[PDB]
Write a protein that binds this ligand. Structure first.
Ligand SMILES: CC(=O)N[C@@H]1[C@@H](O)[C@H](O)[C@@H](COS(=O)(=O)O)O[C@@H]1O
Ligand SMILES: CC(=O)N[C@@H]1[C@@H](O)[C@H](O)[C@@H](COS(=O)(=O)O)O[C@H]1O
Ligand SMILES: [Ca+2]
Length: 819
């Protein structure tokens, strides 16, 4: 049973002919046409039951906001004496962003019903008719827009933005908490100050909040090592309780409980998602920030939620690593796996401080010599950039700073020094490692092997030589010392942030050829190296193609799975079932960022053809591992850098797929829904535009949206009458001509027109090729649009008193703002 829901709708329109009658609400009054509806005395009787639109060039639109989710079967429009010769019907969840549901619609006569049927009824809070052309110069005329269906009186979900989707989240009673400039925060413990710092780092700029630590503040964080959310853990669910938090908020208070300092940062990240996708605004906004009234209880499914970054192929400066850490933290990733060494580079300084007794190795050569090499474009015959990998390395100071910044965002460092293959940078850097069964050998009269194409994929450390293990042990000791110093600088607890794991690699030894004995080499090397990790009170990690040494690595070692089917891999099952091992899941087709994210893009094709947000989301790491939940540590994305030369190009591949892995890492298997995640991507993107982070504008994402935010003009420079009053963020804009801006000013008493200048520094571009090779930074997002107005002299010269109105319209967006 359907009804005309027009009669319960809140009705808006592009405009109206006259202020006094023919209002848009007269399309929504469920009245049959009067007798003789085309007669002018009937169509133009002052009380005629019809909308008469604004004039001008259009488009002209009529929008219904339902008090609930409407399930709409059909729209039947009774057109008046001026009818739409071309129109569409669009839907909106938010009332501002519109999506086509029926296009190519036409009326063909006066006083004509045009019925548009949805064979599958559509569920929507908003619907509108938008018309581009009409039958006469007169105002478009609508007697009736009947929207036939049923309605469910469900309120908007103030928690709909959250990613990852929490364990438990429900709206609470009453108004939102309004954040004020001097709103203070109380913590139970100093280790929670980093969580408040994360909030202040965004909100200080975007909303001018001090968020000072105070006493008896209305926002509190409490560390409770016994926090229990198991009430919300169902028999088919599984959590890591150490990262549990709760939030309980109302109009007067925001109360956070955290099981760990790390969980306090997760709580802060949740609060920043609730405040909305403008918290990283580089400019003070005019709107106040609100935390809606909520009850949240949250913890992750998996304890290990990571990103591998490979600076070894192409270096990433410290400031770029910080921008990665910011977004990793924003999605509750807790692990930064650094692939520090490769055939093509070594990216951290190792000193001669604290060497073992008898060790006179000169470690300073390693960064000096092997920092200076990188992936060679000339050794590629493909679409890889013409530019070689970036060279360089983090100094110990910068590496300690990297550790501290990661820790202050809830992220631990997991170092990898790959061997015995993928190790040419070590041989190239340290004369002393060129001994025993190492490969390749230095040319006659040389103390280190030449960085030439024939070395690549043919490297082996000397698995038979004591110096190999001396060197590895020193590098482990140096990394540990730097990690300890960075955690100390962060103030986060070492018990939380010092990840007692070391990644030995073990992958693809002699992939391109080399000296043979592949298996006997893995077994000797990973046996002795594993013993180094164990004696340092750590758990060994190896890639799955190093489990040739499953029996020689320590009991309880971890496999990082990337290649083939883990569930059928005998050596993985042996580790997990016979050697109390655990698994980190990085199957290439679900987690490898170089795998091209769309069929329109240029990139690696082998794992999926294109591994999209669907491939990154729609998998279950435990069933992919073919093991039990208890044996799965979690997941890591991989950013391999053979082809990456910039943070912009890395972020193209990382985002938004990384936010799918974040949900796989955190969200319960039975709470995952790819369509629900997909709907959340639009605001994920508005926040990335505010951060200045790049992202692939994937075709399978269907929530790309615009968002208008008013700017606090009091903090903006006026130049020759021109001042920034608004920003408009929409991924994919190639220019501003699709957008119509209008602004008016009213001093109390007075509305005058302000001419608007929209200004977008950069346009959207997909990847660019030159001579068959990707151009570095070819794919880049458009800028947020700056919305300037030019003030008249009387307004320019007035003191501080008035109301600014700004309206933005496109075929897919409409918003009117006032302050
Ligand atoms: C205020 C008022 O009466 N305005 C009406 C309009 O709404 C109408 O669209 C127009 C043409 O009417 S038609 O019947 O010839 O198309 O005539 C009058 O201008
Ligand atoms: C463990 C591991 O992945 N080892 C190697 C990495 O040295 C390589 O860099 C990466 C490329 O990823 S791809 O570009 O997505 O194929 O894949 C594997 O070849
Ligand atoms: Ca009517």
């Amino acid at each position: 049973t359907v009804s005309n829901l027009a009669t319960m709708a809140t009705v808006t329109a592009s405009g109206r002919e006259v202020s006094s009658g023919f209002g848009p609400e007269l399309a929504a009054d469920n009245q049959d046409l009067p007798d003789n509806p085309t007669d002018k005395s009937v169509h133009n009787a002052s009380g005629a039951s019809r909308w008469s639109a604004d004039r001008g060039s259009g488009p002209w639109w009529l929008a219904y906001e339902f008090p609930g989710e409407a399930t709409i079967s059909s729209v039947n429009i009774a057109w008046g004496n001026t009818y739409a010769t071309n129109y569409s019907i669009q839907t909106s969840d938010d009332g501002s962003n519109w999506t086509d549901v029926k296009t190519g619609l036409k009326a063909t006569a006066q006083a004509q019903w045009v019925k548009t049927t949805f064979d599958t009824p559509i569920k929507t809070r908003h619907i509108r008719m938008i018309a581009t052309t009409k039958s006469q110069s007169w105002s478009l005329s609508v007697w009736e827009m009947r929207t036939m269906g049923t309605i469910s009186a469900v309120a908007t979900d103030p928690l709909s933005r959250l990613t990852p989707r929490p364990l438990y989240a429900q709206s609470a009673d009453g108004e939102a908490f309004e954040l004020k400039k001097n709103t203070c925060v109380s913590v139970s413990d100093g280790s929670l100050l980093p969580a408040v710092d994360v909030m202040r780092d965004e909100l200080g700029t975007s909303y001018g909040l001090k968020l000072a630590e105070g006493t008896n503040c209305p926002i509190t964080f409490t560390l409770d090592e016994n926090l229990d959310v198991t009430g919300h853990v169902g028999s088919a669910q599984s959590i890591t309780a150490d990262e549990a938090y709760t939030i309980v908020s109302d109009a007067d208070s925001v109360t956070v409980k955290a099981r760990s300092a790390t969980a306090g940062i997760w709580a802060a990240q949740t609060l920043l998602q609730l405040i909305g996708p403008w918290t990283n605004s580089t400019v003070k906004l005019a709107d106040v920030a609100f935390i809606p009234a909520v009850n949240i209880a949250d913890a992750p499914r998996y304890q290990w939620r990571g990103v591998l970054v490979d600076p070894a192929r192409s270096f990433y400066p410290l400031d770029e690593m910080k921008q990665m850490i910011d977004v990793m933290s924003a999605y509750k990733m807790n692990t930064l796996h650094l692939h520090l060494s490769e055939d093509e580079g070594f990216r951290v300084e190792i000193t001669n401080d604290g060497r073992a007794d008898g060790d006179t190795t000169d470690y300073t050569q390693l960064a000096i010599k092997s920092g200076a090499i990188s992936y060679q474009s000339a050794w590629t015959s493909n679409w890889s950039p013409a530019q070689d990998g970036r060279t360089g390395y983090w100094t110990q100071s910068e590496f300690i700073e990297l550790v501290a910044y990661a820790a202050d965002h809830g992220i631990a460092i997991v170092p990898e020094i790959d061997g015995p293959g993928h190790s040419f940078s070590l041989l190239h850097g340290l004369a002393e490692l060129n001994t025993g069964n190492s490969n390749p050998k230095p040319a006659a009269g040389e103390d280190t092997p030449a960085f030439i194409q024939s070395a690549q994929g043919r490297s082996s450390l000397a698995t038979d030589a004591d110096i190999t293990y001396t060197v590895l042990g020193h590098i482990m000791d140096q990394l540990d010392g730097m990690i300890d110093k960075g955690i100390k600088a962060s103030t986060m607890p070492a018990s939380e942030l010092k990840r007692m794991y070391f990644h030995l690699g073990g992958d693809e030894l002699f992939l391109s050829g080399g000296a043979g004995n592949k298996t006997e080499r893995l077994q000797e090397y990973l046996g002795r190296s594993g013993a180094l990790v164990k004696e340092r009170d750590k758990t060994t990690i190896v890639w799955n193609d190093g489990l040739d040494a499953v029996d020689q690595i320590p009991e309880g070692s971890v496999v990082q799975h990337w290649t083939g089917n883990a569930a059928n891999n005998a050596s993985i099952q042996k580790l997990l079932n016979q050697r109390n091992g655990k698994i980190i899941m990085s199957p290439a087709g679900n987690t490898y960022f170089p795998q091209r994210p769309g069929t329109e893009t240029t990139g690696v094709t082998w794992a999926c053809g294109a591994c999209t947000t669907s491939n990154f989301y729609q998998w279950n790491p435990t069933s992919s591992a073919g093991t039990t939940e208890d044996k799965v540590l979690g997941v890591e994305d991989a950013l391999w850098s053979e082809h990456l030369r910039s943070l912009n190009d890395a972020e193209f591949l990382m985002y938004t797929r990384m936010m799918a892995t974040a949900e796989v890492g955190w969200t319960q298997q039975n709470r995952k829904d790819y369509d629900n995640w997909n709907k959340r991507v639009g605001d994920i993107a508005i926040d990335l535009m505010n951060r200045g982070a790049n992202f692939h504008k994937a075709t399978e994402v269907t929530s790309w949206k615009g968002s208008y935010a008013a700017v606090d003009a009091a903090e903006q420079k006026v130049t020759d009458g021109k001042v920034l009053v608004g920003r408009y963020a929409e991924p994919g804009l190639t220019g501003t001509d699709g957008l119509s801006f209008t602004a008016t000013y009213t001093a109390e008493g007075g509305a005058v027109n302000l001419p608007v200048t929209p200004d977008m520094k950069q346009t959207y571009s997909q990847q660019q090729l030159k001579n068959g090779r990707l151009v570095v930074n070819g794919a880049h997002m458009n800028s947020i649009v700056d919305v300037y107005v030019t003030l008249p002299s009387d307004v320019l010269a007035a003191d501080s008193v008035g109301r600014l109105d700004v309206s933005v319209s496109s075929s897919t967006y409409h918003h009117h703002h006032h302050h």
